[PDB]
Known about the structure:
The structure is a homooctamer.
Chain A: E1 5-9, H1 15-27, E2 32-36, H2 43-52, E3 60-66, H3 71-78, E4 83-88, H4 96-103, E5 112-113, H5 118-132, H6 137-153
Parallel strand pairs in A: 1-2, 1-3, 3-4, 4-5
The complex binds 5-aminoimidazole ribonucleotide (AIR) (4 copies).
Residues 10-11, 13-14, 38-41, 65-71, 88 of chain G line the site of one 5-aminoimidazole ribonucleotide (AIR).
Amino acid sequence: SAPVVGIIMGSQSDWETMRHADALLTELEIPHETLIVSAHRTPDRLADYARTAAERGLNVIIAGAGGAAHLPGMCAAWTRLPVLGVPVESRALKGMDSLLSIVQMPGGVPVGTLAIGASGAKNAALLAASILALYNPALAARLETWRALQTASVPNSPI
Amino acid sequence: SAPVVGIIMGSQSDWETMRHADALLTELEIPHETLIVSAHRTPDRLADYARTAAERGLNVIIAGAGGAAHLPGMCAAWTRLPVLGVPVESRALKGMDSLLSIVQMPGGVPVGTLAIGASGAKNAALLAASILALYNPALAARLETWRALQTASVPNSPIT
Amino acid sequence: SAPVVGIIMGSQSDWETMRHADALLTELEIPHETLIVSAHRTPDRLADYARTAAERGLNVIIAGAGGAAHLPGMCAAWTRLPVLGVPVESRALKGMDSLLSIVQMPGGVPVGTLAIGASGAKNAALLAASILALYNPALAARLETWRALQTASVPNSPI
Amino acid sequence: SAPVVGIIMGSQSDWETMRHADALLTELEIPHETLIVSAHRTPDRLADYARTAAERGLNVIIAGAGGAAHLPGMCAAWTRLPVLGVPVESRALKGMDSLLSIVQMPGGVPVGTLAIGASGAKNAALLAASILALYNPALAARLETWRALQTASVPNSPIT
Amino acid sequence: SAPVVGIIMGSQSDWETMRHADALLTELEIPHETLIVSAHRTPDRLADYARTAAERGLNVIIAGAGGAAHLPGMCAAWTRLPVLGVPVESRALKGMDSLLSIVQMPGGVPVGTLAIGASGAKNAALLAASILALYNPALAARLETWRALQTASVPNSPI
Amino acid sequence: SAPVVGIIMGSQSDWETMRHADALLTELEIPHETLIVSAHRTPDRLADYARTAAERGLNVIIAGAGGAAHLPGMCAAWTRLPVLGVPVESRALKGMDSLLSIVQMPGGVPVGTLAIGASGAKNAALLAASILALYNPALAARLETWRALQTASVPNSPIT
Amino acid sequence: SAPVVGIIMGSQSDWETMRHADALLTELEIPHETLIVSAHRTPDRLADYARTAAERGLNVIIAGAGGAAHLPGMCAAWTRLPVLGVPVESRALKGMDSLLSIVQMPGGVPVGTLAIGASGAKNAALLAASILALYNPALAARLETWRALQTASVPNSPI
Amino acid sequence: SAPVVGIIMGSQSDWETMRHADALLTELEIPHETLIVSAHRTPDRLADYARTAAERGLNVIIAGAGGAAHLPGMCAAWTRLPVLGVPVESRALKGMDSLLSIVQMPGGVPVGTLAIGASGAKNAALLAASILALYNPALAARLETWRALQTASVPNSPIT
Ligand SMILES: Nc1cncn1[C@@H]1O[C@H](COP(=O)(O)O)[C@@H](O)[C@H]1O
Ligand SMILES: Nc1cncn1[C@@H]1O[C@H](COP(=O)(O)O)[C@@H](O)[C@H]1O
Ligand SMILES: Nc1cncn1[C@@H]1O[C@H](COP(=O)(O)O)[C@@H](O)[C@H]1O
Ligand SMILES: Nc1cncn1[C@@H]1O[C@H](COP(=O)(O)O)[C@@H](O)[C@H]1O
């Protein structure tokens, strides 16, 4: 019941994208929390969230932001937990700024980065699941079923 | 000493970059294997490697490649384990082709991507360590110690 | 009657683009098959398709995918047949990711890459035709007519 | 020994890259010619070359150029044969201008484009070989042998 | 009455852009012709057009094309006349491919390149005018008036 | 001699670039401090530095970093003072990652960004000087003199 | 009452973007002027504006332009005052041309550059405010309140 | 020998590139002047130069600069003469910033832009020559001869 994954996003505007991570976790029955945490507008809220994440029982953090997307990196700066970053597609640069701001982390503080947009949000949740599955047999089985269904469902020819 | 992390790379030329992931895993005392698997030259070798990773005891796979880097993505397609991708810097496009070829995975098959080059390889190892640390108290302490040392080792001013 | 060209695409979403390759082949009366094969979601389906392509009588394979577009490259990894890649325009990066993921193949396993989008799909079919025309006199004549009509039809001034 | 593949390049400076296509065709015993044809400096030479390629017995044309690389595209405009383009790495833009100038052909006139640089030149030759192999059993066996050797030659682990 | 400027474009689809060059020339009363000439679909039409341009009395050629935009460069390859290139905005790459295909001409055969899109088409006509004005006093005066009106008309504050 | 400008950088490797900002401030006689603060390795050090800048007497902060450059942005998040960012050139992406990571701040938290590399560091110092000059007549005269000298020092023709 | 900040933009078309800088300054009660000044269409208007800015009592200049956005740089060339540049999102290149034309100023003449688009316009006004706050206690207090409200207002979770 | 073409550049560092335009004009016997005019460091010098170009007898202006290259555009803003811009290759962005800063002129003030670097400088001179040739029969013949020689000088095959 207690969340094992924390989904944080820099703004309400990122929800359209991050909701895909939320849906996936719920689908796999992975207890999680979904919050808005701005690296620039609420820096202390972020520091506190990242510092206490482990203590609170969180295993993985999924962070999404657009533009100069510093949320994932700064969260990883304060936590030893694995942090997965989702580049939100920005208006002008289409997430290229989001992508480079997240993936190009110097050695020492990692952020496992996923694709720009909804696909990345969905994959961040799937990656968090594959991580949790390493020590949760029941979830490991549900994830196997999910992957098997994805594979089996692909049509053989276009409509 | 059975391996729990597998480091794979498209070619010997990728080793200059991937050796950083290897060194870091060893530093944190994380048993691992290091191999060369070409997605394009040895596709069946990759299929078998990725497909049997979980049963062989691996928990995380770190895959590095450059240019049209398909190794990480195709590895993830065959394993249910988390796959971390390292974009190896390419000659002409400086790893931008490597980066986009790895990170832009469509929904359903994730690849946790790290920075282009050495930093990405080192961070892939650290990311793998933070994953393993979730269920290994001894490793968790070693990683915490490693992180705390990195922080304490930063100088307060530059050598002018 | 048996297909000599195989058109494969990573998803139904690629059909809007790949249908242009299908239309062109039908126009030139080139027997072909059109399938959905995902490099990531159906990896074994792809391995089997590429391995047996030659045995089945296929001469050329046209593969289209977007984003981290690995379909063309991985298909070429398993077949000795010429593989032509069509970069599908992605939402965020407009096919730049699709393009680099396909064209930047290291030495040893080639993929003849065409333009991003519909133009590339149409040209992949025309390129496959020009290849088949080398050993099919009737098709060679139909292709010559097609090229001649394209040239002759261009207006002399804009409307 | 009549040529069945024609390798053309915009200038002597392109040879460093295109020699890889030449070497590979010779390796697979594919008769070919190698020339310099400038789309901008010798437009009529290009027109005549491309226009008469088929009647001269050529089956495939490999064209390489850098910067605003129009050689492949203009060659394709004058021949009905398949034209393969090799983006030669440029000084400032590292072949990105070469790549986009070649691959972005509008509908109606195709250019099968390969990677920027040496890899693209080698792959253009291999692509040409896979095309010729469709109607040449002897070459088909040589290519199959070449591909099988590439696969078998990949090492299982890196030299650390 | 005889055209002194030739506006050529690779396709009817480029007209939306090149019409701005046409309008500007008409505005300055510069006799010109507007044609469709495809470098790839009508290569011989282009060779002939460029070869005979000077003989026909043309002074400047404005050429527009998108994607692998080879029209300007190949036209300049056959004529000694100044050739101005207009990168047409492409669907996927927004004219970046058009721009690089035109501006990156190696030494020896120049193409004076203008901005991507309508602005470039308008400026190609203005540049052609500034060239013609060097030997046409009446046009030089009309161009001076045009520039003076542009400058004088800029509002002092936004509405 | 109390500092009114603070120059901070992510690492010693940034000094090669940031020394230009330091040199220019000293040239214009602007008291300042120069430190290394890592946004990722010493996040709490950064928080404290940025948070206390105003009370410590600083008027402007110049922050430089490369790659995923978060130092300037996070500094601005904790201080109400104007923060100027210098994109340090990165190995693979040549500072493009540095540039976009710094300049693309969302509405609400500004970072006045300068050019990639040495020019940006020098201009950050000059921008800081033009800010301080608004309420420091002596500095205003020194800056005016500096600008007038730059203008007068430009040669009329090149050495051929 | 006399303006202490000058907002200039290359065209009426930039107003949709620059109005955000205007709104912010008015919100913080910072006396300012808002004008249209084209670096290319009204070069002398710009030279005069920049030359006399300081004499007129202006403290900071916010300049916005798109495409080959030279307005900020050329304004800084004529004034000792701090000049802040706002890259306006261009149609084709989405402000990447605007951004590079503004931020890449060689050493000697700076332009503090903000993000592409509305965010940058809003931040240019906030940056100008943080500069003015250094010598205006009342404004410093209003800016502190503004920042505090921004931070306090961020929701804890998405809707 | 009165100059009919004016070559201007932002700094001495631009000369390495712009010397190619100078050499070509001299080769074609086109009287010209070569100066350094900084749009940012000597704005009034630029205004006066561009404003008086036509009355001084100039017919074409070739302007070269790198980075945020405003020299060509601002020159065009003050003269009614055709202005040709040469993007000088920049350190970090390899002339991409130079290119976009020059070519992307909005409607109303044109700058005929050439390739990044040496090729662009040479082509700017050739473009200027083709403009002057329209009303100078002697120069027209010299240019025709120059073009015909370039064509005839292209080798038929590479040195392998
Ligand atoms: N980087 C960052 C830090 N805090 C918020 N953001 C990003 O700011 C962007 C725009 O936010 P908004 O729409 O609230 O202005 C969002 O995508 C969010 O990720
Ligand atoms: N690379 C790849 C492998 N398998 C599918 N894709 C690509 O995934 C993209 C999005 O697929 P979908 O819309 O089904 O999520 C498609 O363009 C398809 O080419
Ligand atoms: N490069 C070129 C040569 N011939 C035509 N084009 C370009 O092809 C693009 C698309 O043409 P269409 O819409 O007819 O398929 C047009 O922008 C035109 O400039
Ligand atoms: N760079 C520049 C100089 N003068 C105007 N501009 C820019 O020209 C663009 C388009 O202007 P318009 O819509 O009036 O043609 C505007 O974004 C404006 O910043």
